[PDB]
């Protein structure tokens, strides 16, 4: 069957199904309703940065259309909606004055979701640092971010936490560290060779450390001030793509494990075990900041659940570990990614060049977290694939590849859960075609088509797939 035996009955009782967006990617009204600019507003408005010089000024205009979009998700039988609050929509300068119109938007959205029986899962941060904080403090390079983020988090807990019971602090700090500070292709565009300055061998580690410390401080505030009354939870969202040893050699198996440690262990070992992975300590040495015992104790156990964004997989080929002059976080891994084995590609690519369709990667990631980290509560916080630009409306709607993608990936997730993985929920990226960062509007991840000329929504085949699969 086109559902392939999948239904709510195929997953644990009370298992949560949702869709996901992020503020800058869908809201629009980027310079309206009192919102202050983020580092992404500045970046996207700079010619050459984004495909077609596009930006999120309007995006999908969810700001005005949110009731349409909530009605749609309810009609598709989803239980939950993961979205983010724009920090600069609440605090236009990142600190100080509150934008009451901004607060009103999120109240209206949260209240309508609950009215419609959709549980809000709320991210505090999704790449969108207030520009004022980047300029004044140097953003995530500054340890003061822990205080600044905590004050922002505190406001959100106070203001929305009587209704919001499922929080995330950050979205993919690895990608911020990697693209913002190693490669320098995302804001603030820092790297060794970059015009804005930087150092690809040191800054990604500083940035990751400050995300972990800020996460821990915000959760400490939640637990000490808000938890007793509000009785909600706070997690974090981490990207994890699977790495499989290219061969059964000791070298290749070590390479795959090294890649896992530099990718997900970078954050999970501090969050679960209170230290960075040993291999990163051994290889990165004095470039890897050290948690004090007090900080390690604040960070350890500070996530109530682990959000995982899972998309793809690759093979890893090893080498003899070498003494090398440090150049970048990326080069520190001492591995080679490989996308074919025995002459056959690991899988076909979606529109995004990095996204190989490899459903067994979902099983790989979830099983690995279960076995390595004491089976923590995991939520799949984003999974999906993209169509290219320039298709007709009807071609977008007949998204048979995406239907196959979800059926296969969810079957692999089911396999891991049936083997005992502690997965509490699953969220499809995305509800809507949206502003896909550097790809702008040239990458279409939605189960719902958005006509970017008219802003009309049209559910794709994959939307009706979810509706059928999720019927109560
Ligand atoms: O309906 C509005 C809109 O829907 C869009 O999506 C369509 C798909 O294009 C179409 O293929 C899909 O057909 C499903 C059907 O809904 C299921 O009920 C049926 O399930 C069968 C299954 O085939 C058997 O193997 C199994 O044993 O039994 C079940 C249940 O009896 O499977 C077919 C697919 O083969 O329906 C979607 C939703 O309508 C359309 O693209 C668009 O044109 C429509 O406007
Ligand atoms: O994109 C959809 C949606 O989900 C989330 O998107 C994240 C993904 O979770 C994350 O895996 C993805 O990471 C990519 C990254 O964007 C690429 O820049 C990077 O490219 C590699 C390249 O493949 C290599 O050949 C080269 O050597 O190195 C570069 C990196 O230096 O590959 C990784 C995947 O391995 O990034 C997405 C965001 O850009 C987000 O939460 C959401 O907002 C997205 O819309
Ligand atoms: Zn509008």
UniProtKB/Swiss-Prot annotation:
InterPro entries: Glyco_hydro_1 (IPR001360), Glycoside_hydrolase_SF (IPR017853). GO terms for molecular function: amygdalin beta-glucosidase activity; beta-D-fucosidase activity; beta-galactosidase activity; beta-gentiobiose beta-glucosidase activity; beta-glucosidase activity; beta-L-arabinosidase activity; beta-mannosidase activity; cellobiose glucosidase activity. Changing residue 175 to V: Increases KM for substrate about 5-fold. Increases kcat/Km values 9 to 24-fold depending on the substrate. Keywords: Disulfide bond, Glycoprotein, Glycosidase, Hydrolase, Secreted, Signal. Disulfide bonds join 191-194. A beta-D-glucoside binds at residues 25, 126, 171-172, 311, 382, 429, 436-437, 445. Glycans are attached at residues 248, 390. GO terms for biological process: carbohydrate metabolic process. It comes from the Eukaryota. Pfam families: Glyco_hydro_1 (PF00232). Transmembrane segments: none annotated. GO terms for cellular component: extracellular region. The active site is at residues 172, 382. It is found in: Secreted. Its EC number is 3.2.1.21. It catalyses: Hydrolysis of terminal, non-reducing beta-D-glucosyl residues with release of beta-D-glucose. The keyword Cytoplasm does not apply. Changing residue 241 to V: Increases KM for substrate about 5-fold. Hydrolyzes p-nitrophenyl beta-D-glucoside, p-nitrophenyl beta-D-mannoside, p-nitrophenyl beta-D-galactoside, p-nitrophenyl beta-D-xyloside, p-nitrophenyl beta-D-fucoside, p-nitrophenyl beta-L-arabinoside, oligosaccharides, pyridoxine beta-D-glucoside and the cyanogenic glucosides amygdalin, prunasin and dhurrin. Possesses pyridoxine transglucosylation activity. Homodimer. Belongs to the glycosyl hydrolase 1 family. PANTHER family: BETA-GLUCOSIDASE 7 (PTHR10353:SF77), GLYCOSYL HYDROLASE (PTHR10353). This is Beta-glucosidase 7. The lineage of its organism: Eukaryota, Viridiplantae, Streptophyta, Embryophyta, Tracheophyta.
């Amino acid at each position: 069957n086109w559902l392939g035996g999948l239904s709510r009955a195929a997953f644990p009782k009370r298992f949560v199904f949702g869709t996901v967006t992020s503020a800058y990617q869908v809201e629009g009204m980027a310079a309206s309703g009192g919102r202050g600019p983020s580092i992404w507003d500045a970046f996207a408005h700079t010619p050459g940065n984004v495909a077609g010089n596009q930006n999120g000024d309007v995006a999908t205009d969810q700001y005005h259309r949110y009731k349409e979009d909530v009605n749609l998700m309810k009609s598709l039988n989803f239980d939950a909606y993961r979205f983010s609050i724009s920090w600069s929509r609440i605090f236009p300068d990142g600190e100080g004055r509150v934008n009451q119109e901004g607060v009103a938007y999120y109240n209206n959205l949260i209240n309508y979701l609950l009215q419609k029986g959709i549980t809000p899962y709320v991210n505090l941060y999704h790449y969108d640092l207030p520009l004022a904080l980047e300029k004044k403090y140097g953003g995530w390079l500054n340890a003061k971010m822990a205080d600044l983020f905590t004050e922002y988090a505190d406001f959100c807990f106070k203001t929305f936490g009587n209704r919001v019971k499922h929080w995330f602090t950050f979205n993919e700090p690895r990608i911020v560290a990697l693209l913002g500070y190693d490669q320098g292709t995302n804001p603030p565009k820092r790297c060794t060779k970059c015009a804005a300055g930087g150092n690809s061998a040191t800054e990604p580690y500083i940035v990751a450390h400050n995300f972990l410390l800020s996460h821990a401080a915000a959760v400490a505030r939640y637990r000490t001030k808000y938890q007793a009354a509000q009785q909600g939870k706070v997690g974090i969202v981490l990207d994890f793509n699977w790495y499989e040893a290219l061969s059964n050699s000791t070298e290749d198996q070590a390479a795959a494990q090294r890649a896992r440690d530099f990718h997900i262990g970078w954050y999970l070992d501090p969050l679960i075990n209170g230290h960075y992975p040993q291999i990163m300590q051994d290889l990165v040495k004095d470039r890897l900041p050290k948690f004090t015992p007090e900080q390690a104790r604040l960070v350890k156990g500070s996530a109530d659940y682990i959000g995982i964004n899972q998309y793809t997989a690759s093979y890893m080929k090893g080498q003899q570990l070498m003494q090398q002059t440090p150049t970048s976080y990326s080069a520190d891994w001492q591995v080679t990614a490989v996308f074919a084995k025995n002459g056959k590609p690991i899988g076909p690519q979606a529109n995004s060049n990095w996204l190989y369709i490899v459903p067994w990667g979902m099983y790989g990631c979830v099983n690995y977290i279960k076995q390595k980290y004491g089976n923590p509560t995991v939520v799949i916080t984003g999974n999906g694939m993209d169509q290219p630009a320039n298709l007709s409306r009807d071609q977008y709607l007949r998204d048979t590849t995406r239907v196959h993608f979800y059926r296969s990936y969810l079957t692999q997730l089911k396999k891991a859960i049936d083997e005992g993985a502690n997965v509490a929920g699953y969220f499809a990226w995305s509800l809507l075609d949206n502003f896909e960062w550097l790809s702008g509007y040239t990458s279409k991840f939605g189960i719902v088509y958005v006509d970017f000329n008219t802003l009309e929504r049209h559910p794709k085949a994959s939307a009706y797939w979810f509706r059928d699969m999720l019927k109560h």
